[PDB]
């Protein structure tokens, strides 16, 4: 039910607290790193 | 259980505050040697990892 693709080694961990008639407006943007 | 000399188990610490004042506390420390700093102001540096 989680498989994306096989082969990952992250080790850095990070943030949680989910983000979720019905416009959902967002925006991604990268700057510098 | 610690493992092996040549096996020694690494750990990396990211993304957290590191509260090196509390490395103490385990034991009279038959050897606390810092090399390139200081024992005492580690307090005083943010790193990456």
């Given amino acids: 039910f989680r498989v994306y ?23 991604f943007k990268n700057i510098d790193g | 259980r610690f493992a092996s000399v040549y096996a020694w188990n690494r750990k990396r610490i ?7 004042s509390v490395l103490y506390n385990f034991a009279p420390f038959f050897a606390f ?9 580690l307090n005083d540096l ?4």
């Fill in chain 1, 5 to 27: 693709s096989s082969a990952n080694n992250c080790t850095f961990e990070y943030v949680s607290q989910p983000f979720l008639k019905n416009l959902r407006e967002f925006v």
């Fill in chain 2, 14 to 20: 990211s993304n957290c505050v590191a509260d090196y």
């Fill in chain 2, 33 to 41: 040697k810092c090399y390139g700093v200081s024992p005492t102001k």
């Fill in chain 2, 46 to 49: 943010c790193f990456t990892n």
